[PDB]
């Protein structure tokens, strides 16, 4: 039983695996898994519960916090403006954010008496899109700089806005001279701020007009509307013993409020069908059902390794993206990119691109096989289980042409 | 006379060569040689005797000790379970064999007072499939560690079982920190033990159900059944003067008994037609006559060079696989892989994969030319003559398109 | 929507929107002429703003522009036509054809005219001339005592300057470095023009006319603007602080209107978008347009290769301003730049993209992977001022919808 | 417009114009025979000037030429025919077939016959012979005490010389270096010829005739010119100062007209453009011409690969004159040079272009990317004198018009 | 040296002008030896330390010492210092002065 060169009986191992290894033993609440090849959806399965407390099951239309899977959407948004001539990647950020002209590199000291050295060159927009800015994230919990992000709540918090992020970051140091290393950052939240600066629109309006309406994604937003809140999943966090506990109730969630923070880095709620339509648009070279969000050639450029000398993340990453899963994987303008299949120790193709969210949401596009996967669950953090590698083994196992 | 772009008159040089250089001068007892291209068998020749003492000739259906040619079959078996999500290659072995958690690297001393250092990282399943474990073989005869394997008879002997191997190896050191070198090992025997752990079946039953029955291989087994023992060849060993002497009588062979040792590394008896069906299945991307043993993509992954930085065996091998014949040849998940044709000093194609047995059995698959060869003889050891390189010269010489 | 040769014409309209919003309305450029072609079809052609601000005259399709250093690919084609006839080899020493140059030496120290020199490791070759690895320089570089000597002798141009004077003066000057060991943009292409003359027996304007302009149907390309075409000749502007510009060359009163006796293979030509399009399209086709062949397919493929050592980019070998970030991942062949690494260049495009530019902000490229090309004309010195040629690449590559 | 197989025949006429203007009229060469083929079709064939100046005899299509070192590809094919029959392996030691060579040692110091030696890291292999990494040399190298010993023993050729004498004398001489660690052009191909004899049971002239010349229809290729064909045999000339030449070998009373006992796999053959064309075309086709097969398609593909370590060019490994600029970006396989990097070579052509030359300025190449080939015949020693083979490449590649 | 008559870093060709254009051996047999330019001229310090690039006939290693032997520059019938200096002016050096050491007629 074969569609688009995929054995559907082999794809049934996905549901068998998620039941046996995660759902029955109580490691995940529930899952939504979609696989497509050559434009055809060949697998779509909801399993377990979206809300354990209320015994509500996962459905095709269940809404999920996709978190950092927001970043590819923000990256597409900014590259739409690149295609209109609005900026160049090698332009300094301080051309658009002049208060950032004299950013300096951390040397020593605690906030707010941090001493700094001059950088070799100013931060560029390419540095923002590739996380080579020298910016960081509060949750990194490694350096005095991310300690300053936490005391100023730059990851989010009451009264946080993009305007406050840009203003606070102007008076903070960088982990390193821009371009000389890689560190996962609020840089994509800054990219969102640049979409606003250049388009004249707030980020929710830019996304709606130039991405969600054209692709037919009616269930993707920064704020879950009151009338759709019944469909919104609960979020769970890891507990010792391979268990989980309630982390966010859908009723009385900050995702249900219009607080003033539009996070290009982690803000969006979506569903498997909406993210599938985004992913399929990219797999097609930027077009779905006569709507174009990006040029074929612009997207090809975003999918290239933009790290120096075709290095992988572990050759440049100062932190946790140094670890064995990211071996043979580079980074472009908002996507990871597989460079070396054997080195990654995971079956796949050179050029496989995608990203993930910290609640264990994942997607990839294999341009060699014209194959893609969207996986939705709500378990923080994504570092907990290697479910996204097991799914790659089963899905690549189902190719039979 | 040309079939599948091969001149059959040029292929007749095989039989002329094996007669002139080996059979008439009494260097080999007998040979069975098969060549196929694009799904079509273009050469099949039995020559000389399977049993010199009893004057019995080699026939198409003659049974041969294929030894280390068992390893690709064991590798396919374990990768079938990879495709079901049952493990990941970068997982530690001690996750499945917990007694192995505190394995350490040899420093100095004789068994049983060997001193050890901490390894930089624990052994992984990828390390087992690629012989980068730090495990070894008794017959290596190079180090105090392989001396301990010999005094404990871990290569085989009276009362030996997979359960005993895993138990003894838990109290022995490694030649080196896992991943940091290559050394041919009992690792594939351990892979067989993991097929058992994960499937719930003994290895002979897993092979029968998931490989031999589907491919139509009724003459491949760990134990030769009583009613087929008439077809079983004698095994010969090298003697000075380019001669040979009886090493194993087929009547009263340990291969005719069900002793308790199922060797994923060296145990199987087979015939040219059965191994042809396995080889042709691989050449086709894992399918023969509607039966699938492995996914096309999973097999493509096993055929890649899994050595660090695309190095050849001589750049990482601590032992005999360091020598000139293995120049320009890497190693994947149970197969050698040609990297550089000129450097190997042997005609062929980049990507040529296969392996050999210590009784001078050999097979290869050239994925560039869709060409393959199965060669059967019984002369220990395989290091004696370069017959497998002469056959490559003749076979590649017969391509006429 | 409206698609020609796999290009969305609505997406290509962003070119005109961009040049208006970013350059013309704010008064950074006087006027622009932009042409884009793919698979032999012109898919974009737009004049905007003024060719002469003082006289309120608009840019038209037929407006004539100082293309300057975009002369160099034409001179390079001319010399490679003679390579195809067996007249020289690239690894031959220049002094075989210019014997007075046999004892050229490398700058060590001193001011003109008491410059001390060292022996070069090897003599200058013709390949060194075509790739700017000669060790020659330009007066306008303003970096070294050697380019100071070029300026005091007016070797970039000036009253009574001829190719014969350049070759004679260069014989008594030192090189910035031992030939082949570095890259420095130079009068080398002016010397290439002198070699076209030596080998063909013709003056450069006659060689270009007979062997390139007549065959390709380029009637509006010349070293001297004829009296009867001077109405069509654009003014040249130079940058002023505040992202402004001032008159640099009045068309009526221009040295480009006189036959002053310097035929510059490096910077001399005046042309128009249609003439340079026909040259560019000929190259994109492998050296042929409408049955006329200016170069062999294979000879051109050879000119488009990276001729720098060890497949290095300009910043790994360039001693000067071509060291800077825009030329990262870009090499150099026989008269063209060549893109090596798209990500490294930080600009969308294809490996193999070739072309060059003029110091008045004229630019052209040919993408052989996409069979795409662009000719961009404006008159604003210097071209280092604005990154307009990168913005145009972003918009044009953005319009591909295959 | 004459176009055959994507080649402009008007552009190919530049060959004859060039050889007249640059070589024949000025008296640098006596005469030339030039053939060019593409996709199986001969597109150029021109005799020019004289085969014998003293007797005023012109060059004809059927003129016989000393092809010298262009013998080596034929000897290489002969030995690889036996590789295909399983008779040897490339990584086997030579001393397995020539046991007297087991204790060969590397030159340290001293003059013949009191040369001191060191142990080699490994014994010489057959791959070392086919790639000139043996450590053997040639008398005419005139660089080392070892080639001085070759000259005093006349191992390049001389009265009473035979292959049997070469193998016997070489057993008592040292190597320039430990086998595999460098490249030096050598008598190694003469030794390959000796191995064709050892393995086949036939003398080399009989092996060539039966297994190469008869099958391909090459009736005018031999070690000895038969009496009835001596009228067709060209004179050989050597360079004289002033770009002139002098008689080096009279065809009447030539050693090439005698059956002396020396069958040179390295330099012995006389042939003609048509015979060498048939050999070249057989190789361009993958080892087959008009139903006759001399070598397997795959075996030939293996001979055309770079067999130097780490994909190095000749200048990265060559101890001698093949270190110089013309061999930049060129490697070496089993009897052929192989182009690696077109730009680096400074000569138009394709990656994979293979061929070789003779010391009397005979040359051939096969471009497998363009399915193009050339055979060029003249008699002017030495081939290092003029760059005619690079000029011909420029004109021939210039004639591609698809 | 102590009387101020020369300095060690002075070129030899200051005192032996025929030696100004000495060149380094590349290839060939005497008397048709091809040569390359040296990086710097031979100095008196090079003579006193055997870093000249000169050699001795008896070395029996190179084509250059073969030329010394056929010209009997180590000694023999009619040999004088005047003949050594005259013959050495027309011979190549084993290497560019200063870049190696080779025991020689330098003394
Ligand atoms: P992403 O899911 C991080 C985005 C949101 C973090 C703010 C608390 O990382 C993979
Ligand atoms: P294989 O044939 C080794 C098989 C196990 C032998 C144990 C004595 O090695 C190439
Ligand atoms: P080109 O436009 C240099 C032309 C010569 C100018 C001499 C005054 O440089 C990019
Ligand atoms: P070949 O033509 C060398 C032939 C041997 C010459 C014997 C003196 O070298 C390119």
Joined tokens for residue C398: 């953005």
Residues 6+ away with beta carbon under 8 Å from B84: A13, A16, A17, A394, A397
Q: Which helix (H) or strand (E) holds C354?
A: strand C354-357
The phi and psi torsions of C183 (rounded to 5 degrees) equal -125, 135
Residue D9, helix vs strand vs coil: helix
CB-CB contact of D334 with D307 (8 Å): yes
Say which ligand is closest to the CA of C138.
Answer: 3
Pick from B85, B295, B297: which is nearest to A17 by CB? Answer: B85
Rounded Cα gap, residues D396 and D6, in angstroms: 12
Joined tokens for residue C397: 């590559």
String of DSSP letters for B116-147? EE--SS--BHHHHHHT-SS---GGG-SSHHHH
Is the preceding omega at residue B88 within 30 degrees of 0, hence cis? no
String of DSSP letters for A228-251? GGGGBPPEEEEETTTEEEEEE-ST
Output DSSP code: residue E99.
S
Query: Which of C136, C358, C360 best tests ligand 3's pocket when mutated (most atoms within 8 Å of CB)?
Result: C358
Rounded Cα gap, residues A234 and D158, in angstroms: 96
Question: Which residues share a beta bridge with B264?
Answer: none
Helix, strand, coil tally for chain D in percent (to 5)? 35, 20, 45
Rounded Cα gap, residues C259 and B272, in angstroms: 87
- Give the E-state strand segments of D68-223 in sequence order: 106-109, 116-118
The phi and psi torsions of A153 (rounded to 5 degrees) equal 50, 50
Query: Does residue D359 have its Cβ closer than 6 Å to ligand 4?
Result: yes
CB-CB contact of C23 with C29 (8 Å): yes
Comparing CA positions, the residue from E95, E88, E2 lying closest to residue E50 is E95
Rounded Cα gap, residues D399 and D387, in angstroms: 19
Distance D263 CA to ligand 4 centre (A): 13
Q: How far from the centroid of its chain's Cα atoms is residue A277's Cα?
A: 16
CB-CB contact of B394 with B10 (8 Å): yes
Comparing CA positions, the residue from C269, C109, C264 lying closest to residue C187 is C264
Domain coverage including residue D268: 1-402
Give Cα separations from C209 to B73, B246, C294, D191 (angstroms): 73, 89, 11, 59
Give Cα separations from A292 to A284, A287, C252 (angstroms): 10, 4, 49
Residues 6+ away with beta carbon under 8 Å from D109: D115, D116, E59, E60, E61
Count how many Cα atoms sit within 13 Å of the Cα of residue A271 in the half-sphere of its side chain: 24
Q: How far from the centroid of its chain's Cα atoms is residue A92's Cα?
A: 24
Query: Does residue A265 have its Cβ closer than 6 Å to ligand 1?
Result: yes
CB pairs < 8 Å spanning A and C: 69
Say which ligand is closest to the CA of B266.
Answer: 2
Rounded Cα gap, residues E41 and E21, in angstroms: 8
| C310 burial level (CB within 10 Å; 0-12, 13-18, 19+) | exposed
Rounded Cα gap, residues B224 and B271, in angstroms: 12
Radius of gyration of chain E (CA): 13
The phi and psi torsions of B169 (rounded to 5 degrees) equal -65, -25
Which ranges of B303-379 would DSSP assign to H, the alpha helix? 341-344
Output DSSP code: residue A67.
G
Residue B373, helix vs strand vs coil: strand
Say which ligand is closest to the CA of A131.
Answer: 1
CB-CB contact of D105 with D175 (8 Å): yes
Helix, strand, coil tally for chain C in percent (to 5)? 35, 20, 45
- Give the E-state strand segments of A196-341 in sequence order: 235-239, 243-248, 269-270, 287-288, 291-292, 329-331, 336-338
Chain A residues in contact with B298 by the CB 8 A cut-off are 347, 393, 396-397
CB-CB contact of C234 with C47 (8 Å): no
Tell me the pairing of strands A379-380 and A235-239. parallel
Comparing CA positions, the residue from D76, D11, D54, D155 lying closest to residue D356 is D76
Quick one: residue C25, left, alpha or beta (phi over 0 = left, psi -120 to 50 = alpha)? alpha
Other residues' Cβ atoms within 10 Å of the Cβ of residue E86: 11
For chain A, which residues lie within 8 Å of any Cβ of chain B, measuring from their own Cβ?
7, 10, 13-14, 16-17, 21, 324-325, 341-343, 345-347, 369, 386, 389-391, 393-394, 396-401
Give Cα separations from B38 to B272, B280, B354, B370, D357 (angstroms): 18, 9, 17, 5, 40
- Give the experimental resolution in Å: 2.7
Joined tokens for residue A266: 């982690």
Output DSSP code: residue C301.
H
**Helix D163-170 vs helix D188-200: crossing angle, to nearest 10:** 120
String of DSSP letters for C40-95? TEEEEEEEEEEEETTTTEEP-TT-BEE-GGGGHHHHHHHHHHHHTTTS--TTSBGG
Rounded Cα gap, residues B176 and B107, in angstroms: 9
Rounded Cα gap, residues B215 and B274, in angstroms: 8
The phi and psi torsions of C323 (rounded to 5 degrees) equal -80, -15
Tell me the pairing of strands A2-3 and D372-377. unpaired
Rounded Cα gap, residues E39 and A150, in angstroms: 64
Minimal CA separation from A184 to chain B, in Å: 24
How many independent structural domains does chain D possess?
Answer: 1
Residues 6+ away with beta carbon under 8 Å from A271: A32, A60, A61, A62, A63, A64, A219, A220, A231, A376
Chain D residues in contact with C89 by the CB 8 A cut-off are 346-347, 387, 390-391, 394
Experimental method: X-ray
Q: Spell out the SS3 assignment of B258-316.
A: CCCCCCCCCCCEECHHHHHHHHHHHHCCCEECCEECCCHHHHHHHCCCCCHHHCCHHHC
Minimal CA separation from C100 to chain D, in Å: 21
Residue A319, helix vs strand vs coil: coil
Q: How far from the centroid of its chain's Cα atoms is residue D296's Cα?
A: 21
Question: Which residues share a beta bridge with B158?
Answer: none
Rounded Cα gap, residues D379 and D358, in angstroms: 9
Count how many Cα atoms sit within 13 Å of the Cα of residue D99 in the half-sphere of its side chain: 0
Give Cα separations from C44 to A371, C41, C373, C401 (angstroms): 36, 9, 11, 15
Rounded Cα gap, residues B398 and B2, in angstroms: 9
| C143 burial level (CB within 10 Å; 0-12, 13-18, 19+) | middle
Rounded Cα gap, residues C258 and C250, in angstroms: 13
Distance A24 CA to ligand 1 centre (A): 28
Rounded Cα gap, residues B74 and C272, in angstroms: 71
Residue of B nearest to A13 (CA): B84
Other residues' Cβ atoms within 10 Å of the Cβ of residue D40: 11
Output DSSP code: residue D315.
G
Residue D12, helix vs strand vs coil: helix
Distance A36 CA to ligand 1 centre (A): 26
**CA-based torsion, A62, A66, A72, A74: positive or negative:** positive
CB-CB contact of C368 with C354 (8 Å): yes
Rounded Cα gap, residues C190 and C266, in angstroms: 5
Say which ligand is closest to the CA of B355.
Answer: 2
String of DSSP letters for A126-177? HHHHHT-SS---GGG-SSHHHHHHHHTTTT--TT--HHHHHHHHTTS-BSSS
Residue D215, helix vs strand vs coil: helix
Joined tokens for residue B80: 């079938």
CB-CB contact of B215 with B277 (8 Å): yes
Joined tokens for residue B107: 């420093």
Other residues' Cβ atoms within 10 Å of the Cβ of residue B223: 15
Comparing CA positions, the residue from A297, A302, A247 lying closest to residue A76 is A302
Chain E interface, best mutation among D115, D139, D143, by max E CB count within 10 A: D143
Residues 6+ away with beta carbon under 8 Å from A293: A76, A80, A210, A211, A214, A215, A281, A286, A287
Query: Does residue D156 have its Cβ closer than 6 Å to ligand 4?
Result: yes
Question: Which residues share a beta bridge with B317?
Answer: B182
Give Cα separations from A107 to A110, A119, A174, B92 (angstroms): 10, 11, 9, 39
The two most distant CA atoms of chain A are separated, in Å, by 66
Joined tokens for residue C121: 């490791």
Note whether B touches C: 3 CB pairs or more under 8 A.
no
Looking at ligand 3, which residue's alpha carbon is closest to its atom 1?
A: C69
CB-CB contact of B392 with B364 (8 Å): yes
Q: Do C326 and A295 touch (CB under 8 A)?
A: no
| A126 burial level (CB within 10 Å; 0-12, 13-18, 19+) | buried
Q: How far apart are the first and last CA of chain B?
A: 13
Rounded Cα gap, residues E51 and E2, in angstroms: 22
Q: How far from the centroid of its chain's Cα atoms is residue D270's Cα?
A: 12
The tokens 């005497």 sit on which residue? Answer: E30
List chains touching A (3+ CB pairs under 8 A): B, C
Residues 6+ away with beta carbon under 8 Å from C252: C230
Output DSSP code: residue E23.
-
Rounded Cα gap, residues A248 and A244, in angstroms: 12
Residues 6+ away with beta carbon under 8 Å from A164: none
Rounded Cα gap, residues B314 and B291, in angstroms: 37
CB-CB contact of D46 with D60 (8 Å): no
b/e code D156-178 from CB counts within 10 Å (16+ = b)? bbeeebebebbbebbeebbbbbb
Other residues' Cβ atoms within 10 Å of the Cβ of residue C250: 14
Rounded Cα gap, residues B233 and B28, in angstroms: 12
CA angle D101, D104, D108 (to 5 degrees): 165
Residue B243, helix vs strand vs coil: strand
Chain A interface, best mutation among C343, C376, C399, by max A CB count within 10 A: C343
Residue B178, helix vs strand vs coil: coil
Residues 6+ away with beta carbon under 8 Å from A100: A93, A94, A123, A166, A169, A170
The pocket around ligand 3, CB under 6 angstroms, is made up of C 68-69, 140, 156-157, 266-267, 357-359
Radius of gyration of chain D (CA): 21
Give Cα separations from B373 to A319, B280, C299, D46, D113 (angstroms): 49, 10, 45, 49, 53
Comparing CA positions, the residue from A339, A349, A342, A340 lying closest to residue A370 is A349
Rounded Cα gap, residues B153 and B189, in angstroms: 14
The tokens 């000249």 sit on which residue? Answer: E52
Rounded Cα gap, residues B60 and C340, in angstroms: 56
- Give the E-state strand segments of B168-285 in sequence order: 235-239, 243-248, 269-270
The phi and psi torsions of A315 (rounded to 5 degrees) equal -80, -15
Other residues' Cβ atoms within 10 Å of the Cβ of residue A321: 19
Rounded Cα gap, residues C390 and C396, in angstroms: 10
């Amino acid at each position: 039983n074969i569609i688009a060169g995929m054995d559907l009986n082999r794809l049934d191992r996905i549901a068998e695996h998620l039941d046996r290894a995660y759902l029955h033993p109580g490691k995940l609440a529930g899952t939504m898994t979609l696989v497509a090849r050559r434009g055809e959806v060949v697998y779509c399965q909801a399993q377990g519960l979206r809300d354990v407390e209320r015994q509500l099951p996962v459905e095709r239309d269940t809404l999920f916090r996709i978190y950092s899977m927001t970043k590819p959407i923000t990256s597409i948004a900014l590259m739409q403006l690149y295609e209109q001539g609005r900026f160049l990647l090698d332009e300094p950020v301080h051309k658009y954010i002049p208060t950032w002209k004299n950013l300096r590199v951390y040397k020593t000291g605690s906030h707010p008496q941090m001493l700094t050295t001059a950088p070799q060159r100013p931060m560029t927009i390419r540095d923002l899109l590739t996380h080579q800015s020298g910016l960081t994230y509060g949750f990194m919990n490694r350096t005095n700089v991310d300690a300053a992000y936490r005391s100023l709540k730059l990851d989010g918090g009451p009264g946080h806005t993009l305007d406050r992020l840009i203003d606070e970051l102007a008076r903070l140091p960088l982990e390193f001279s821009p371009g000389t290393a890689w560190n996962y950052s609020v840089a994509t939240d800054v990219c969102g701020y640049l979409v606003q600066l250049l388009s004249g629109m707030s980020l929710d309006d830019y996304f709606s007009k130039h991405i969600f309406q054209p692709l037919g994604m009616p269930d993707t937003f920064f704020t879950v509307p009151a009338e759709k809140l019944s469909r919104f999943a609960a979020c769970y966090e890891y507990q010792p013993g391979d268990s989980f506990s309630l982390q966010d109730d859908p009723q009385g969630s900050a995702f249900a409020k219009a607080h003033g923070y539009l996070s290009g880095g982690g803000g969006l709620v979506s569903c498997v069908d909406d993210y599938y339509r985004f992913a399929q648009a990219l797999a097609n070279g930027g077009e779905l059902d006569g709507a174009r969000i990006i040029g074929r050639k612009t997207l090809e450029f975003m999918r290239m390794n933009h790290l120096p000398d075709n290095k992988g993340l572990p050759d440049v990453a100062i932190g946790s993206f140094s670890e064995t899963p990211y071996d043979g994987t580079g980074f472009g303008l908002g996507f990871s990119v597989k460079l070396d299949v054997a080195k990654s120790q995971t079956v796949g193709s050179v050029g496989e691109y995608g990203w993930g969210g910290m609640a264990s949401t994942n997607f990839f596009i294999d341009p060699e096989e014209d194959l893609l996967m969207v996986f939705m669950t709500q378990l923080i953090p994504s570092s907990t289980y290697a479910v996204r590698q097991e799914l790659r083994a089963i899905i690549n196992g189902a190719l039979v042409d």
